[PDB]
Amino acid sequence: SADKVIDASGLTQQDINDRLAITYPTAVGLVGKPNLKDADVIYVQCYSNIFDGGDGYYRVSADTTTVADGAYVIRINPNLIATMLNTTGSVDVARFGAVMNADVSPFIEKAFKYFRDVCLTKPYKLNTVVGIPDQNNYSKNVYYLRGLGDPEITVDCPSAVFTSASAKLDPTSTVNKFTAKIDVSNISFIGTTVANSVVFNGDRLYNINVHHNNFKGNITIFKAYVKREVGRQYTQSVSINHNHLTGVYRVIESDKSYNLDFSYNMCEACIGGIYVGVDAPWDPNNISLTIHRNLWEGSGMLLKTNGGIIGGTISANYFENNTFNDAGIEKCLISINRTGTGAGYASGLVISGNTFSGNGAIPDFVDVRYVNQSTESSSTSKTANVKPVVFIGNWSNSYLMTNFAGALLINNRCSNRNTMFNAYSPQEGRVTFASGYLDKPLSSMLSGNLLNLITLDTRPCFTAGYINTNFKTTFDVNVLFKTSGGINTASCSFKLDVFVYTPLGAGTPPKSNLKAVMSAFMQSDTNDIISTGVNETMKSVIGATPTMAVVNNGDGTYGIRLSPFTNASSPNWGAITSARIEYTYQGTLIASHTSTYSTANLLTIT
Amino acid sequence: SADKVIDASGLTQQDINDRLAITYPTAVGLVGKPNLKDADVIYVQCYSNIFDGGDGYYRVSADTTTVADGAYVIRINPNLIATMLNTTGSVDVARFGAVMNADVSPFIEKAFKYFRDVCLTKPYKLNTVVGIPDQNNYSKNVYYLRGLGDPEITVDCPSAVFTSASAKLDPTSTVNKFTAKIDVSNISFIGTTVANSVVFNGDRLYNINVHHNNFKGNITIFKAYVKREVGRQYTQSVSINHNHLTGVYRVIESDKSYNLDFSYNMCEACIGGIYVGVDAPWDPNNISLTIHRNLWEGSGMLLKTNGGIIGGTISANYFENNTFNDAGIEKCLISINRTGTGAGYASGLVISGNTFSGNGAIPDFVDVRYVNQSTESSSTSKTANVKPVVFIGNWSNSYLMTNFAGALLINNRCSNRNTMFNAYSPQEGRVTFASGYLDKPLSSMLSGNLLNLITLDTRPCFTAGYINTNFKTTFDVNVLFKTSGGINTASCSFKLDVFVYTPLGAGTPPKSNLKAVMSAFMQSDTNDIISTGVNETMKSVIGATPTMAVVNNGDGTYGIRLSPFTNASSPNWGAITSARIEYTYQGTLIASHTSTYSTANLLTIT
Amino acid sequence: SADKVIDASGLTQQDINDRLAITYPTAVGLVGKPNLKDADVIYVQCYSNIFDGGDGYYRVSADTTTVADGAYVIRINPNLIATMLNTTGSVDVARFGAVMNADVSPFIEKAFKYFRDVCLTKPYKLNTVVGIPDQNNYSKNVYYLRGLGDPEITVDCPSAVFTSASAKLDPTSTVNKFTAKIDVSNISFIGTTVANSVVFNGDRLYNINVHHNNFKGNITIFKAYVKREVGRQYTQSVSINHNHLTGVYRVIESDKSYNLDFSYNMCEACIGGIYVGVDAPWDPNNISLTIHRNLWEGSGMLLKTNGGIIGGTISANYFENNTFNDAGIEKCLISINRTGTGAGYASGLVISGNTFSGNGAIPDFVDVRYVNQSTESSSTSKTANVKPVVFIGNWSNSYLMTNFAGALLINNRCSNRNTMFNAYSPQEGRVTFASGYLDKPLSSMLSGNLLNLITLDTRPCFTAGYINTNFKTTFDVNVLFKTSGGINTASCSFKLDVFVYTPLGAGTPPKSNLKAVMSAFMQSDTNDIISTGVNETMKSVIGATPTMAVVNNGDGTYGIRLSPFTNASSPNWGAITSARIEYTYQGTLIASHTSTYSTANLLTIT
């Protein structure tokens, strides 16, 4: 007996025996084993071979009934089994029989059937299709697949590796055999042949967050296969963010794409990017498309369609030296066309803060080809069924940023801006606009038949820079004259051109000066009716030959006086007592003897 | 004795004994134990029950003095204790006594008191309030709470589960009882009753990054409770990014919100989103608000306020089919109002690249209701105390995108654009603007009393498309005439209307042609003073009836010649020798016989 | 013998012996050891001291030849060694001999030589330079360095801690001694002296994602050192996102920076931010620069340059109370200057949705100083070699947002907007623009010598609000007259001013009314040539004194009738049969008796 025995501690060999664990070499080695009971917890030092790991706890229970898959439940003998206990929360795929440098695909498939978080720590190959437990985009759960150790996964499979459990069974059902809610992280995927390097199935994976991974050589990250939406393939709620990419064949290949994201990636020497609605365009062919904050350098075309893009953001990217593959052929980094049966216009697309450089190798690189987007055949500017791209605060030193005149350009630095038909903003072209109103008792305006309508005051202009105080202004002035009861019995309107000047090159002058010309005088008359019932007309308060004088008030303010004014009265409503004066002006901002602009903003109307 | 014994190795049973570890079943089982000494390191196979895990190392020390909490320090006997050793860096909550499917709340509270990274690997329930060690937003540290295994956490608590250690003690102090710097990740939170499913306390948690989690059923992710800032609740520096969301009752409920982020989430069939300043609006009621790059589909209202939003970005989102709950009632996805005591205007809000679709079910869906934002009562356009939303390159097929005329619209694709009073840009309405200057020795201009002022050159127009070379241009020309010493003794200004035409439908014509009309001629005169001291005036250099001729130079260039010009001289300064010519034009861009625009950009002024 | 012995189980002490693991205390303790064979797998309970951890598996092999580093391979004796087995995938640095509160730098250097994922779980100090295995930005691999337990790392090193293996050897080579592809996460870095707290080397680390960490006290996150690009240092593809920051001395210090990102950080009481091209500016000195969605509060200057920024986004940030350090000196949060040899202009910079508040302490805070950016010396507005910043839907209550008049302002809420020379948009200043065309058989227009050119229709205006139906419109109308064979034999052009008025303050009137004035009439004449060959001219179809009448059609529609019209015919081509009518208008939108705008958008041209 053992208690009789004495360890060199001075301890009973029994009192040792008690502080001791059941440990076996291999998981698969449990089948043999005697001398194990229900409630026994055992520690297996690896699954198969040690260089492959797979270590973890089992629990032995008394089990007659339940069949045994061969990893999660192992039959020790006819009436005893071991079930796998997960400790680390996330589970090595090794624990399921995954072997270093082999096809890990059956093993990932196996593991996900028992667990939701599953992790690779060893180099593997993916040669077969992984199906993934089916759940909808309303599910309680999120399948994770994690990288610890930066596992180097070689991709080599005739299909897209990853699919739904269901669709793996019928890979071709045009029935929506989909799985959602997946997170893939911290893995270096490594490609083989182009044809064999497709990682995810777009037909089949929705709501997938692919983040902080690494892709290398001839990988296609997502492919679509089956025509399933009026003759089109589609993908849905795919997001690729914070990955490195190198040599990548395609970021995504599909007919259509819903809700696709490509953010904060670092992509070197890739072949191609987002090829969507290329062969088979559609009217909406990308519906939400985000390309934010990537590096994409020394590379091919980043985006290529033949169909419409809807609700697109291409922001804060860095694009250096993209003269390769399709980019060198087509001489552009983004190529938006519309051609082929189904193909629609791009609409609602913002392109901002991107850097487009070093495409110098191609003397005629266009950064963003936008072809067949004309809708100049439409007879008005007033509808917005179709709206072209707006580009904003980008920077390009390529030959052209874009070739479509109807692209809206807002403060883009670009070569050959004065080649391009695109509209210049009033801001670039140093033009400003203001508007306001005055309400004025007539009492205060009327002098004989002179209506002292408005004062222009150039003191704010002078104050702020007498040099800058040289500008032309053009005003629309609309006057609504009102009876005491506030009935508009008379109205008139006129353009006014105003020139504000202050002599330069002799030091501070006494003041600024002002001239004005009126034109395009119009007013209400007795043919314009207020009430047919009680027989009431509008009137004409200005007489034969409208006359405007500029009154020089000698300190930098100017009255605009309007002549022959006559009051008219209604039996009902009385005479006019007051006027509402609505002014809208545009001013010249150039002030070419300074560093800055003209004081036109500061011209005051009282 | 043991060395006498012989294992079937041919090894001394003592030489075995030596390569062996102290292992016990349970952590709580250490209390009993004899035959343990100071420096002893022991391996416990689980805390309580095995199905719950909790396994890790202890160290036994000789300890008389220190009291024992019951997990981190366990009393083996009066003079011996075991302290917990953390290996995995992040610590299972199991190791503290957390049990599968129970309230994990005491256990999370316990663990965080000893460790900063704490991790859930087992399904649990949260039924009680977790307080969290108090630290300020200037702290050395970041509390993490991690998900391994996608743990399914059921939320069922009459308060917001997570709070500050302090505020858990007085849940109502209007004193700022806050904790900052928290990271929560990789967990599926699962809701019960609406009333019981609030996860985080906004009053109490600042600087919290909630990322790559999952929320399901009637969760409110954040609630605010106590009025604490002039009658308002507030939250601060909350960020929710890369989560899935499904059935979510509210993303956030509060009076006010500082610095709140909602990025790259995937949200299906949610009830409601960001309800802020709804019951109790305020003037700033959301101060920084980011809603970037989410999926939000088949859902309720995404954002609803009654107070002002300040510094808002709603970008690159995909919004399909949001006709539910409050969205179906109020017939909008975002509902910005101003009403109720305190309520202010929205100001500084950019909404770009969003996709707003399939709200067809409600024939009169408005995407963004913006109600009571009028400030048209203000008498000028010149102040920016209040500034409305700018919408830019979005896409909507809803009945209206918005209902406020003062929203700025830049290249949004939307239905009924010609319903809406919003200003059309000069770019949409095919108008362009340019400006420049010439400096010219008079010597080169003056011929008799003809001032050959400027040349217009339509060769650049013709070169680039003789068809497109049909446009009207309107120029403001300001001329500052200067003495040799560069004193501005004379100035004049005029409008010029220029029509550029090239006959179509007969092949390439010899050239483009040009006509012009001058108007709104004004000039300086002797009443405008340069120096009162030395008695110096401005002059008038153009005589009775200003006359402009267009000179046809026969090759596509045109002189603009100004008539009666007479020099004037100052005793001091001499005659005029040179002029500075400042031009500002606007041109028509429509060119309705082509696909493109008019050559107006390319008209050259020399 | 052992099988003779009997454990209190009733089990043969041999049948125990068999279910048992080889366990030693310490890794370093293996050297002594006898009684171990090839294939033996052993479990070491810590590396050195237990409080430091380091526990993991070795494998014993028979080894004569290979030398032993002292952690990964340990010599047990002349012909036996132990190699380290990695289980957890990511490897504790402890396993390499890292000790609590010491310089972990040699140990990180050691570990990365064997593994790519390496993790800190214990407080340490970084006192020496860590070199990092050299790989290019096209590499199969990504070095990770992880945080578990929120390890508190003190930084205290006379160089930047982290560098390339190569550059650690020659720290000064102007040769491009770089390493790429690194991920650093979940660590609290803690600073000492400013001079000693630099974490990463910009010269040497490319493609580095620094995310979800914590920085505290006098840390400089990145420094550049060596002049290496035409007298400049540079950094490349650095991204700092989702960190906390507190007390941070500099986010980045460099001459130049390529492709730099600063996203979703939470930064409190920092000293300074992105100091780039300060001492030594350059023409492009930041090439791609993203500052998105940070908190930056109670802090110093966030960005400071003296060189050009190219392709910049500063979006959705919250900036409260930034009155400190350099911010209080220079009285600004961003300070973009151009000065010192090499220095260029900022170009292509979008600043949107930021919140700039509580800088009240400095009565004259400018949020974004933009100094020496004038390029008003350029003679046209038409080139875009240089383009200034565009600011859009930000919010500021600082004294000024910016001080450069040439910044483009789009719907920014800001103080003193009517101080600033920046152009007001036509939209703010309540101006709208539309354009279209009509094609019309002359047959339908011509009546005697009256050309009934176009109808204006104010019914759409009235329908939508008879109060708002008071506006001035100014139209450019260009008419291209065409022979049956569609040859443009005649053309004319005119301005038209149109006043649309409807009397207010008496209930719904019968209709809206309309007046118009024509001006700036021009037409083709026989001097304009179609074909010199076959001797063909353009003609004049309007006679002595062009006359336009407004025809009141009595229901809210108005003909514009043009007078003396005469047909002209070509021998070749016949008479004119049809005209193409191109209209471009601008309208006043103010409608100061309502909450909204004028109906000008809805005026219809048929």
Residue numbers in the entry:
A (entry chain A), B (entry chain A), C (entry chain A): 155 to 760
From the paper:
The capsular polysaccharides (CPSs) surrounding the A. baumannii cells are the primary receptors for bacteriophages encoding specific structural depolymerases that determine the initial step of phage–host interaction. The genomes of Friunaviruses encode only one tailspike depolymerase (TSD) specific to a certain K type or several K types with similar structures or linkages between K units. In the obtained trimeric structures of the TSDs APK09_gp48, APK14_gp49, and APK16_gp47, each chain contains a particle-binding N-terminal domain and a central β-helix domain, as well as a C-terminal domain forming CPS-recognizing/degrading parts. All depolymerases studied were specific glycosidases that cleaved the corresponding CPSs by the hydrolytic mechanism with the production of monomers or/and oligomers (dimers and trimers) of the repeating K units.
